[PDB]
Amino acid sequence: MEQLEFDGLVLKNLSKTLTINNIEIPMRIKEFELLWYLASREGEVISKSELLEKVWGYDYYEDANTVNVHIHRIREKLEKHDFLPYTITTVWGLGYKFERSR
């Protein structure tokens, strides 16, 4: 898959950019790759460990809590640009999942 669409949110993996209502939203590459990994697995709860291993596999991190920080950054950007119908749900202690809101 090169492109995912979720009611107005479009993820473009070739360019590692994202649009909301066809407007590009600045996002760093790690944040995009995290979002892409989750949205590619809509509805699946992905543990911090799998995210660190498969999204940061090559990049380094002092602190596993870089995952949480990045989840928050993604949700802040979606929320700030009034994107409501999909979000990343935190499943406490278990992981994160991209899914329809509620």
From Swiss-Prot:
Q: What is this protein called?
A: Response regulator SaeR
Modifications the protein undergoes after translation, according to the UniProt entry: Phosphorylated by SaeS.
Q: Summarize which parts of the chain are annotated to bind DNA, as ranges.
A: 1-100
What fragment of the whole protein does this chain represent? 128 to 229 of 229
Which organism encodes this protein?
Staphylococcus epidermidis (strain ATCC 12228 / FDA PCI 1200)
Gene name linked to the record: saeR
Compartments (UniProt record): Cytoplasm
Q: What is its biological role?
A: Member of the two-component regulatory system SaeR/SaeS. Probably functions as a transcriptional regulator via a specific DNA-binding domain, recognizing motifs near the promoter sequences of target genes.
